[PDB]
Scaffold this active site. Sequence first.
Site, short mmCIF file in Angstrom:
data_model
loop_
_atom_site.label_atom_id
_atom_site.label_comp_id
_atom_site.label_asym_id
_atom_site.label_seq_id
_atom_site.Cartn_x
_atom_site.Cartn_y
_atom_site.Cartn_z
N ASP A 72 34.99 -97.39 25.81
CA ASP A 72 35.96 -98.13 25.03
C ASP A 72 36.66 -99.17 25.91
O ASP A 72 37.81 -98.99 26.29
CB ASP A 72 36.98 -97.17 24.41
N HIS A 88 37.64 -100.91 20.71
CA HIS A 88 38.07 -100.56 19.36
C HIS A 88 39.12 -101.53 18.81
O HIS A 88 39.47 -101.46 17.64
CB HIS A 88 38.49 -99.07 19.27
N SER A 133 47.01 -99.19 21.88
CA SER A 133 45.59 -99.31 22.19
C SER A 133 45.22 -100.60 22.91
O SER A 133 45.71 -101.68 22.59
CB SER A 133 44.78 -99.15 20.92
N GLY A 134 44.36 -100.46 23.92
CA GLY A 134 43.94 -101.60 24.70
C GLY A 134 44.90 -101.87 25.84
O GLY A 134 44.55 -102.56 26.79
N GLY A 190 48.84 -98.94 18.18
CA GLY A 190 49.44 -100.20 18.55
C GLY A 190 49.50 -100.35 20.06
O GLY A 190 49.70 -101.45 20.57
#
Length: 223
Positions: free
Chosen positions: A84, A40, A177-178, A175
């Site tokens: 994801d 994402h 994320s990942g 922010g």
Amino acid sequence: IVGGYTCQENSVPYQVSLNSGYHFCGGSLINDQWVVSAAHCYKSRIQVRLGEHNINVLEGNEQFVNAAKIIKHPNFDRETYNNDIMLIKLSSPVKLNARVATVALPSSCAPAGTQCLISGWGNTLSSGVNEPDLLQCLDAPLLPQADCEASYPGKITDNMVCVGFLEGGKDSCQGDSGGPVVCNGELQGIVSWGYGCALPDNPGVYTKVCNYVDWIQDTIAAN
Ligand SMILES: O=C(C1CCN(c2ccncc2)CC1)N1CCN(S(=O)(=O)c2ccc3cc(Cl)ccc3c2)CC1
Ligand SMILES: [Ca+2]
């Protein structure tokens, strides 16, 4: 990271910032030329920043490298956030040192109750938005799948794991994320989604990295 603490300078050497003019996601360095993040967080052009602490101040340990290949997991479903996970091959290998190091892939799925470390430059507020300058850290346990599924009826897949606190107060946020959730030196999760930030009975859900070890190694070898 909501309710976390400022990490010691360069104490999370595998943490990277995905920058597209501004920090928008995090990631983990798994080897001198590959970074794992969330699907994402995909963008056609990304500059990976390593050796960061303060993202808005040059401190002397940074290495900025552009992404050469951005590979989202083939079965990523943007509606359910299932699968994801994304892999980024850097245009050139980075210099590995104290402030820039790799994190290991999981050898097995960590049991619920395992204490993990989550880090990121994401929103620090439970309501509203506040982007921090310094890397934030959070010590949180893996929650039982039963509590995860209970919190999100019908949304939790076998490729997702909840990490955090059912009481709220501490959690990942936009922010982050990942970004990584490392338990005992191994990357066990990737910051994926949540319906809010640090809300009671709404723990954050992460991509279960132990389910993709093979895909990761294969993709790396074939690229
Ligand atoms: O509620 C949502 C979406 C999240 C994605 N989404 C689903 C719905 C069903 N299944 C999977 C994902 C639909 C609702 N958002 C509000 C929170 N934002 S966020 O503050 O930017 C955010 C982003 C990443 C997070 C990661 C974690 Cl681990 C915890 C909270 C997070 C919060 C993301 C979108
Ligand atoms: Ca900096």
